[PDB]
C-alpha cells in the first residue's frame, strides 16, 4: 500500500518538465512533498504527483499508481516494457491496452514515453516516439477545469501544468495555449523551430488537447521596444544579474542569436541599424529600462526596472 518511502530511488519531474533521477530523504505526509537528493547532491522539495519510483529489477506485481488490489474484472495489470512498472489499465492516462489485444505486444507507459520524447528546445518531431508522444498529449493526467489560478492566470496552486502535469514557471520556457489558457513546457512541445527565450510570450499557441491533434504555433511580430526588453529579461534570467553592457553583452547576444530571435519584419535590418535602433529603444523608455547613469555608472549599462517579462 505505501508508495513512497525514505531512501527510495526515484524519478522527479522538474519545472522544465524533465525527469531527474534522485533519492527521497524525507517524506512530508502533511504537505504531500518529499525531499529529493539528485546526482549533483542538490536537495529540493518535490510534490508527490511529480515523483515516480525508479525502475526495480524484474517484474512488479502491484500497481505502482494505486498500490492496491482491484475486484473489478477487465482491469488487468499491464507492465511497461521500458521501466517494468505495472499498471492497472484504468490507472493509466490514457487507458492502457491489455497484453496482445491492441496489436503491438509491447506497450510503453506515459512516463517513459515522455522520458524518451522530451528534450530541451523541443521534443521529437518524427519517429515512433513522436507519434506515441502525440497520442499521450491528447489526454491530461489531471483535472484542468478544476485548477486554482491566480488573477493573471500565471500560476495555479496545484502546480499542475502542460501535458505532463508537472510543475513549471510561466516565465521560464513555457507557452500559453490561447484556448485553455494553460501553460506548456518547451521540452514537451513538438511545434517549435527555435528554442524559447525566457519571458517570451510573443506567441500564438494552441495545444494538442484543444486541437485534437498536432500543435499550432505562430510567431508574433516584435517591436524594437520588445526586442530590447526580451533580450534584457532573457539575459537577466540566464546570467542572473541586473545591468548589462550594451556593446559587449547586449549587442553581441542579439547578433549571435539573430536567427533564433525570429524577428520577422525586422530580420532584414543591417547590423549598423541594429545598434542604433536598440540603443534608442533602451534610452527612450525609462518606464521599462534603467541606465547605469542612474546609479553612478557608465551610460552604456542597461537593466530592467523590475525583473519582469515583456508585456504583450
Amino acid at each position: 500500500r505505501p508508495r513512497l518511502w525514505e531512501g527510495q530511488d526515484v524519478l522527479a519531474r522538474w519545472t522544465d518538465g524533465l525527469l531527474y533521477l534522485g533519492t527521497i530523504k524525507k517524506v512530508d505526509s502533511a504537505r504531500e512533498v518529499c525531499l529529493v537528493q539528485f546526482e549533483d547532491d542538490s536537495q529540493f522539495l518535490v510534490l508527490w504527483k511529480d515523483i515516480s519510483p525508479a525502475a526495480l529489477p524484474g517484474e512488479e506485481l502491484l500497481c505502482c499508481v494505486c498500490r492496491s488490489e482491484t475486484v473489478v474484472p477487465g482491469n488487468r495489470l499491464v507492465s511497461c516494457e521500458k521501466c517494468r512498472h505495472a499498471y492497472h489499465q484504468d490507472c493509466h492516462v490514457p487507458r492502457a491496452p491489455a497484453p496482445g489485444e491492441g496489436e503491438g505486444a509491447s506497450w510503453v507507459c506515459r512516463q517513459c514515453v515522455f522520458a524518451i520524447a522530451t528534450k530541451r528546445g523541443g521534443a521529437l518531431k518524427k519517429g515512433p516516439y513522436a507519434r506515441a508522444m502525440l497520442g499521450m498529449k491528447l489526454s491530461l493526467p489531471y483535472g484542468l477545469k478544476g485548477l486554482d489560478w491566480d488573477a493573471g492566470h500565471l500560476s495555479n496552486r496545484q502546480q499542475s501544468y502542460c501535458y505532463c502535469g508537472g510543475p513549471g514557471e510561466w516565465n521560464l520556457k513555457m507557452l500559453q495555449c490561447r484556448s485553455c489558457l494553460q501553460w506548456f513546457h518547451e521540452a514537451c512541445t513538438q511545434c517549435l523551430s527555435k528554442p524559447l527565450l525566457y519571458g517570451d510570450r510573443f506567441y500564438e499557441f494552441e495545444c494538442c488537447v484543444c486541437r485534437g491533434g498536432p500543435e499550432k504555433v505562430r510567431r508574433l511580430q516584435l517591436r524594437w521596444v520588445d526586442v530590447a526588453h526580451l533580450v534584457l529579461y532573457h539575459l537577466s534570467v540566464c546570467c542572473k544579474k541586473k545591468y548589462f553592457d550594451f556593446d559587449r553583452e547586449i549587442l553581441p547576444f542579439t547578433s549571435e542569436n539573430w536567427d533564433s530571435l525570429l524577428l520577422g519584419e525586422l530580420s532584414d535590418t543591417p547590423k549598423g541599424e541594429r545598434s542604433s535602433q536598440l540603443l534608442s529603444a533602451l534610452n527612450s523608455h525609462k518606464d521599462r529600462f534603467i541606465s547605469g547613469r542612474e546609479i553612478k555608472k557608465r551610460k552604456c549599462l542597461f537593466g530592467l526596472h523590475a525583473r519582469t517579462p515583456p508585456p504583450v
Binding site: 524519478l11 525527469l19 531527474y20 533521477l21 546526482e39 549533483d40 542538490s42 522520458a115 530541451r120
Partner: peptide, 7 residues
C-alpha cells in the same frame, strides 16, 4: 553532473 534521465 545533474542531467535528465534517459532510457
Amino acid at each position: 553532473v545533474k542531467k535528465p534521465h534517459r532510457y
